[PDB]
Nucleic acid binder design. Structure first.
Lengths: 58, 122, 194, 76
DNA sequence: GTCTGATCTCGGAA
C-alpha cells in the first residue's frame, strides 16, 4: 500500500511499525513455539485411559 | 518535546448514546491537518459541549519543582498501544484515543511509549 | 438397472487392481455405454474374468443361491487351468451347506465369496474407510523392530472383515492403515490380521 | 537416549518422593540448608540446586532400559 | 421390575 523497504529508511519513520516482526522476536517466537510444543506432550506413564474415563464420564 | 498538536472541533459529544455517567466519547476533526480523533474525556471534571473548539497537544514530557507544562487545563497520561493514513491508538487507562490520518505529521509516534494529553478550551 | 452388471464389473476390476494384478487401464474404467454392448441381452454366464499377477478367476453364477453342484461346475475347471485363486460373486448368498465346501477345499484353491450388494460400492473409496495397505514380509520386520513388538500385541483386524476380505488377506499378514487427520493427515496405524 | 529429555511430572514426584523419605532418615543433605525442617521442602531445594543422588531407571516396555541422571534432565 | 446376552428347542430347506 505504501512505505517501500528499500533499505528500511523512508522519510516518515513511523511506517516501519506497521507490521514489525524484527528478528530478535521471530527467533524468540520459534524458541517459544518449540518449547510450548515440546512441553505439551503426553508425559510418559500418565494413566491415559484414567483421564479418558473421567473426561467422558463427567 | 511535543509529539503532535492542533486545534480540534468536537462534532459528536457521544456518537452511539450515553453509556457512562462520567466519560463521554468525543468525535473531533482537526484544523487543516484533518486528523480525526475519537477521544474519551472525563466530563465531570472537564465538561465539553457540542461544537467547541479546543486545543490538543500530545507530549512525551511536560518540560511542581520542574515547573510543568501547565498552561493547558486538562492533562491525562497514557501509552500508545497500537498503530494500524495511519491510526494511532492511545490508551489512558481505559480512556481510548484513536488519532488518525495523514502519516507524515504522525511521525513522532511509536508503540509502547508514554504519552501525555494537554487539552485546553478556546 | 444395469448400473449393477456393470459396476460390479467395475468394482472387481478395481478390486483385483488393488490386489496387484495387471488390468489394463482402458479395461478398468467403462462408462455404461461401453457396457451397453451387452446390456439388453443379460437381463432378458458371459461374464467371467481371468487376470494374472504382476491368477484369480471371478464367477458370477446366475443362480441366486449357489449350491454345492454349482461350485462343482467350476471345481473341475479350477483344477483344469492350474489356477489357484478364485472369486464367486453371488446374487443372494450361498446355501449354508456350500460355505463349508470352501473351507473343506481350503489350502488347495482359495475361492473367496462376495455378495452382490456387498460389491456394488467400492468400500475402499468410501470416505469413512481409510487407505488400508497390505505390508510386505520385510515391512513387518522393520515394524516389529522399531516398536520392539512381538508379532502378536499389534492391534488386530478380523480375517472376515469387509476390507480384509476385499484385499484378500490370509492370517498372519499386517496391514498399514493411513487414517486421515486434520492437523497431520498421516496418522498411521497398523493391524495384524486374525 | 531415545526417551524425552524433560523430567515428567511423575518423575519429579517420585524423586521428590524418595529424596524426602531418604532425608527424613538422616541422609546427608547436599544443599547446606537454611532452617527448613520439613523434609519435603529440603528436597525441592535439592532439585533446584540439581544435587540429588538419584538416577531414574526408565523402562521401555519391551524390557530394555535407559538410565537418566536427575542432573541430566530438564525440570520445569 | 425390566434390560440384558446365552443357551436351549423347533423347522424349513439343498
Amino acid at each position: 500500500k505504501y512505505g517501500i523497504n528499500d533499505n528500511g529508511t523512508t522519510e516518515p519513520r513511523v511506517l516501519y511499525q506497521l507490521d514489525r516482526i524484527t528478528p530478535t522476536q521471530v527467533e524468540k517466537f520459534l524458541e517459544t513455539c518449540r518449547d510450548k510444543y515440546m512441553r505439551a506432550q503426553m508425559e510418559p506413564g500418565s494413566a491415559v485411559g484414567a483421564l479418558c474415563a473421567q473426561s467422558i464420564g463427567e | 518535546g511535543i509529539l503532535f498538536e492542533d486545534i480540534f472541533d468536537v462534532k459528536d459529544i457521544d456518537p452511539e448514546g450515553k453509556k457512562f455517567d462520567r466519560v463521554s466519547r468525543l468525535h473531533c476533526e482537526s484544523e487543516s491537518f484533518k486528523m480525526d480523533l475519537i477521544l474519551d474525556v472525563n466530563i465531570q471534571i472537564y465538561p465539553v459541549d457540542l461544537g467547541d473548539k479546543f486545543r490538543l497537544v500530545i507530549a512525551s514530557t511536560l518540560y511542581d519543582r520542574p515547573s510543568r507544562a501547565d498552561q493547558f487545563e486538562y492533562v491525562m497520561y497514557g501509552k500508545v498501544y497500537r498503530i494500524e493514513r495511519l491510526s494511532a491508538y492511545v490508551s489512558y487507562g481505559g480512556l481510548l484515543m484513536r488519532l488518525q490520518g495523514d502519516a507524515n505529521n504522525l511521525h513522532g509516534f511509536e508503540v509502547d511509549s508514554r504519552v501525555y494529553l494537554l487539552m485546553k478550551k478556546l | 438397472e444395469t448400473y449393477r452388471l456393470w459396476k460390479i464389473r467395475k468394482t472387481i476390476m478395481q478390486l483385483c487392481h488393488d490386489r496387484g494384478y495387471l488390468v489394463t487401464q482402458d479395461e478398468l474404467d467403462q462408462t455404461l455405454e461401453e457396457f451397453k454392448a451387452q446390456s439388453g441381452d443379460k437381463p432378458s454366464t458371459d461374464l467371467t474374468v481371468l487376470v494374472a499377477h504382476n491368477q484369480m478367476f471371478v464367477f458370477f453364477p446366475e443362480e441366486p443361491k449357489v449350491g454345492i453342484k454349482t461350485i462343482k461346475v467350476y471345481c473341475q475347471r479350477m483344477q483344469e487351468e492350474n489356477i489357484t485363486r478364485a472369486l464367486i460373486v453371488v446374487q443372494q448368498g450361498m446355501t449354508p451347506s456350500a460355505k463349508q465346501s470352501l473351507v473343506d477345499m481350503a489350502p488347495k484353491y482359495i475361492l473367496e465369496q462376495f455378495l452382490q450388494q456387498e460389491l456394488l460400492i467400492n468400500i475402499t473409496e468410501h470416505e469413512l474407510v481409510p487407505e488400508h495397505v497390505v505390508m510386505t514380509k520385510e515391512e513387518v520386520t522393520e515394524l516389529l523392530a522399531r516398536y520392539k513388538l512381538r508379532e502378536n500385541q499389534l492391534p488386530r483386524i478380523q480375517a472376515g472383515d469387509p476390507v480384509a476380505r476385499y484385499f484378500g488377506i490370509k492370517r498372519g499378514q499386517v496391514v498399514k492403515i493411513i487414517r486421515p487427520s486434520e492437523t497431520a493427515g498421516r496418522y498411521i496405524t497398523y493391524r495384524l490380521v486374525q | 537416549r531415545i526417551t524425552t529429555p524433560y523430567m515428567t511430572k511423575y518423575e519429579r514426584a517420585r524423586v521428590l518422593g524418595t529424596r524426602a523419605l531418604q532425608i527424613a532418615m538422616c541422609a546427608p543433605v547436599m544443599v547446606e540448608l537454611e532452617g527448613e525442617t520439613d523434609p519435603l521442602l529440603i528436597a525441592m531445594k535439592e532439585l533446584k540446586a540439581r544435587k540429588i543422588p538419584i538416577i531414574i531407571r526408565r523402562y521401555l516396555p519391551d524390557g530394555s532400559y535407559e538410565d537418566w541422571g536427575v542432573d541430566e534432565l530438564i525440570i520445569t
